[PDB]
Amino acid sequence: PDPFLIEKIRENTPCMNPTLANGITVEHTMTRDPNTGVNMTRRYIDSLFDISSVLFPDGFKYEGNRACTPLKHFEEITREYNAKRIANIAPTDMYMIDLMFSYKGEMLYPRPMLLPAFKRGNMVTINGAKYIGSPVLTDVGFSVLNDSIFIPFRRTKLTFKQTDHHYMCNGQRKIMYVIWSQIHNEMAKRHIESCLAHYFFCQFGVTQTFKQWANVDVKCNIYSSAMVLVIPRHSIFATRLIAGFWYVVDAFPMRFTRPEYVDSTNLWRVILGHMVFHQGKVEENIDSHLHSFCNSLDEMTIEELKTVGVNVSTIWELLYEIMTSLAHHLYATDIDETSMYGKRLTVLHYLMSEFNYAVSMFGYMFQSRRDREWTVQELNEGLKRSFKLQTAIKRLTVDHGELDTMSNPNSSMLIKGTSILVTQDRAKTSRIIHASIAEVGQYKNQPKNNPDGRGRLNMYTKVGPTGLVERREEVREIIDNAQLMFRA
């Protein structure tokens, strides 16, 4: 071709986003800080232990992580057992780090741990096989599917649903929605479901519950079953509180023999435990359950909700906003399910899930054994019992939907490499049209798994530093006009 022709063709062609084209998994896992020289994956490990420090007994600290020399790396994977040193020569892309802990100023035994390394093109070799690690497009903050608000925490996952109950106000029968969620798991191991107002009554007094949040001076407008509660003639949140109170009371009327006992705290906990699970064991058991519940809002989840605009600092503040500001999502959602604009490309949350599981269970062990003197030997045995050599990578090639076998007959990096996108539904092993597919996905690229074009990533997508999908203004009008005609 004419050399002048190529220059004019090049001058008139926009360039792809190099971050997406070169591979975003590499950019999110192996990028090193210029100041300290520690990559993203190791920094993620530090953040995990920061949010879990509130469950640590006094004197126990996490000192960080260190890179292991190849000599120690070789010695650890060839440790002698039964007078035999097994060496696996199948190629792998792994490196080793040490986890440092201290107790009252005394350093404990370091725990070696293996982590995977990624190369250009989202390529990784595990046990002699080549794989591709693809990002997952996920909702930020919370997800809504069908009369349900899914909120993922680092240690828990909660779903909030709705039920309707009948209460009689001023002699008039009324219907109100009751929001409930299953927060204890032996309740699943087991009729009334755990109501949020019931949790409020378990924590605060009923009068305190109404005055502190609803600013309502409940007495003993008259509300009765279908015992009297009296409210001044001059809210929806208060109505939901009343509905939940009567929902709890109606199916457990024997417990409330005297009205004043409503304002207690132990009685509500006894009822909750009988729902979940002898009174003596039940009362003590929940007192720990409510203790762990009050510390379940980690710092990382708070920042995620802040981006959506929730602004919650304590777990009780979150429950208030679910009953007040996010209640309409249960019946009349204003968020388009088929959109792709307010989402984030996430890598580490799915890559480091098994390690995150170990960290959470380590913190729960301390909670289950509160008020106990810890010896150095006991702590060393506990650390060895949870953080093992292959804890993080033991299931990468088993049930991780973002890792797939590589088969590329040519040298191109884009066609089936860095352009693979994983939907949130298939993250761990369609929908109607939307104009955002033309900007974020590839609506004509239709593989069998994702025939709607949402299984591939547009290489010209605009992505923020943290992986948030941004909007392109130069195509805003044409995208908007099509969306109107799609729904017309």
């Binding site: 020569i89 040298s411 392109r472």
Partner: protein
């Protein structure tokens, strides 16, 4: 709709941006095209397309290659094998390893970079890495390089910046009988330009159980396997191993017996005959007292292991020197860290500590483990798959000599014959425009070639071009003719070409190439059928439209009654070339006595896959029981379910005067029905439970 107006640009299309006529193709076919480009192996004759949308420039930026990740300084350069003139010398060095240092860094991280001769991300397809001569000849210790400097890359990435995804082929749309069911009729010379290359590795284990045979040596030299640079011997055997048995030494260990491979009783690994060995890796277990290998059978094994040990020993020495100088200040990349671990796994352990028991994914290594890498070039002929860039998938069903393919009145010879009727039934009309417009573009370049006095088909030389460029009036006239064609077929290209700084250079390039390359962006504001009508009614740019001549299937030279137009199409090869065929007359069974499945260890033990095929499922036996009849159907099953019946079949073939005309294979009087293992197991289990199935009296 306002014909001639387009809104969608490259940023909204995705992979579809490679097609300049996406709007004229149905969505079902457009999806097929995007899938196809991900299944296309690199061919030897790849070249840039005649029509460019500009997306090829972007796709040529992101390919698997060898780069300097950051601004670094070269510390050491290592070679796996010492290519020289020594007693133990290797013809070529497969791998060069580079140790660098990020000197523009606070911690001065030290990394490693490998430079092989090929890459292979597919099971059986790869490509050669072409070294950049300027950078390669420079590389030496104490040299600084810039970030993102390419050392080697595939040959598809052209120097101009374009990408080679296929080969342009002359196509005539005809209804020849060889085009039935999406078949292609292919010129033999064209298939020589669509040859892929496959890279594969063979693994052998020897030691306490078996020893290598003398497959590549003579009466005075023992050479179990070919060296680097050799080729696989004609029958395809790379190496074979024989079991250890001392009492059979006067028989199995004579010099003649060590040269003869026994197919029934030995084990061999078979690859493509004529393939060239390019790399060898050997692992040895040195803490064996005494080694079970007989003397004189390890000269070749020791030669490669000794050089390999030196390569790993130097790597470990380099790290230890770095660790001594930079105590607690040494930072290394994750790739370098794993490399040092490999070196320690390879080198012998000190005598004070226990030896290593080496494994490869739960497979214990023996004394010797040999891995041989070879490359083969495939000639497409029959059953190969092809497609254009418009979803028109096809299969090569007939190959003709170059002299027999259709030829037009201007001397153009077709590379393919494709049935045109299927275009209307699939509505992929981008096929028509590339074919039709390319024919006009090709004829225009050839017309200017003849007007200048050159041969319309042969590539002109420098002397001829220099004389042609001497005349200025013709050069100016030629440029205007090219511009006039651009005005019709490509408006955006036409505006850019108005102000060419050197019009003579553009004309010279066209005459040399023999084709004017056309820039056709996806958002080109051109009415397609209005452009087609202009070309037909034009006295300048009307493509030649006449008869063609070819040799039919009866060997007769004929000429067509209708006018046939010849034009180019971008073609690409597809994977699954049908190399996984299976055929077996007798298969190895289980302890139960039924045919067994094939594992990877036995996959390459034969030139072709010898696996029993489940040709009679439950559904087939339902059909056979009704048409053929239950009687003969039971006979077919019993010839396999009963191993003794199968033994009778083989004996019948071997003892027959005419093995293909045996009256009866199994004598049912000598081997009556009732010997099938699955039925006997069924009866036995029911009998233990206390029941039996019987005919109703």
């Amino acid at each position: 709709s306002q014909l001639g107006r387009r809104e969608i640009d490259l940023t909204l299309l995705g992979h579809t941006g490679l097609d300049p006529w996406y709007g004229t193709t149905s969505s079902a076919r457009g999806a097929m095209f995007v899938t196809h480009i991900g299944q296309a192996p690199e061919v030897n004759g790849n070249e840039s397309r005649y029509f460019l949308t500009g997306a090829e420039l972007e796709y040529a930026k992101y390919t698997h290659d060898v780069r300097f990740p950051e601004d670094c300084r070269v510390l050491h350069v290592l070679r796996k094998y010492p290519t020289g003139i020594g007693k133990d010398s290797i013809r070529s060095n497969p791998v060069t390893t580079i140790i660098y240092e990020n000197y523009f860094d606070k911690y001065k991280t030290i990394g490693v970079l490998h430079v092989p001769e090929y890459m292979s991300h597919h099971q059986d397809f790869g490509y050669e890495l072409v070294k950049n001569r300027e950078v390669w000849e420079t590389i030496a210790p104490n040299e600084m390089f810039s970030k993102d400097t390419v050392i080697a890359q595939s040959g598809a990435v052209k120097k101009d910046g374009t990408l080679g995804m296929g080969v342009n082929a002359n196509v005539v749309f005809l209804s020849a009988a060889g085009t039935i069911e999406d078949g292609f009729v292919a010129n033999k010379n064209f298939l020589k330009r669509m040859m892929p290359t496959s890279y594969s590795t063979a693994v052998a284990n020897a030691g306490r159980k078996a020893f290598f045979l003398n497959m590549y040596g003579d009466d005075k030299i023992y050479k179990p396997f070919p060296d680097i640079g050799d080729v696989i011997r004609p029958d395809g055997v790379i190496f074979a191993i024989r079991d250890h048995d001392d009492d059979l030494a006067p028989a199995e260990m004579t010099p003649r017996a060590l040269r003869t491979l026994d197919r029934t009783f030995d084990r061999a690994v078979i690859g493509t005959p004529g393939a060239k060995v390019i790399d060898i890796d050997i692992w040895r277990d040195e803490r064996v007292n005494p080694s079970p290998t007989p003397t004189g059978m390890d000269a070749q094994l020791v030669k490669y292991h000794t050089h390999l040990s030196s390569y790993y020993r130097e790597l470990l020495k380099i790290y230890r020197g770095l660790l001594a100088r930079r105590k607690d200040d040494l930072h290394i990349t994750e790739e370098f860290e794993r490399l040092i671990v490999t070196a320690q796994m390879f080198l012998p352990q000190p005598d004070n500590v226990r030896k290593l028991s080496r494994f490869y994914r739960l497979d214990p290594l023996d004394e010797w483990r040999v891995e041989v890498t070879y490359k083969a070039q495939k000639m497409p002929a029959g059953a190969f798959k092809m497609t254009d860039f418009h979803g028109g998938k096809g299969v090569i069903c007939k190959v003709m000599e170059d002299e027999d393919m259709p030829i037009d009145e201007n001397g153009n010879r077709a590379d393919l014959i494709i049935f045109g009727g299927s275009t209307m039934r699939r509505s992929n009309y981008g096929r028509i425009y590339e074919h039709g417009f390319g024919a006009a573009a090709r004829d225009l370049a050839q017309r200017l070639r003849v007007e200048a006095g050159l041969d319309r088909h042969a590539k002109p030389t420098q002397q001829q071009l220099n004389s042609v460029m001497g005349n200025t009036q013709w050069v100016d006239y030629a440029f205007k003719e090219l511009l006039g064609f651009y005005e019709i077929i490509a408006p955006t290209m036409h505006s850019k070409m108005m102000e060419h700084p050197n019009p003579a250079e553009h004309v010279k390039t066209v005459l040399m190439d023999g084709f004017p390359y056309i820039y056709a962006p996806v958002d080109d504001p051109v009415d397609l059928m209005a452009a087609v009508n202009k070309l037909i009614n034009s006295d300048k740019y009307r493509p030649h439209y006449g008869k063609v001549s070819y040799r039919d299937q009866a060997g007769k030279w004929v000429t067509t009654k209708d006018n046939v137009l010849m034009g180019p199409l971008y073609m690409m090869l597809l994977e699954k070339i049908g190399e996984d065929w299976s055929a077996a007359a007798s298969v190895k069974t289980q302890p139960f006595g039924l045919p067994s499945k094939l594992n990877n260890a036995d996959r390459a033990s034969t030139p072709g896959r010898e696996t029993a095929i489940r040709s009679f499922g439950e559904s087939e036996t339902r059909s056979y029981n009704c048409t053929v009849g239950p009687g003969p159907t039971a006979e077919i099953l019993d010839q396999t379910n009963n191993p003794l019946a199968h033994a009778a079949v083989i004996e019948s073939w071997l003892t027959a005067e005419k093995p293909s005309s045996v009256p009866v294979a199994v004598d049912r009087e000598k081997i009556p029905f009732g010997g099938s293992r699955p039925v006997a197991m069924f009866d036995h289990l029911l009998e233990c439970s206390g029941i039996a199935l019987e005919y109703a009296p």
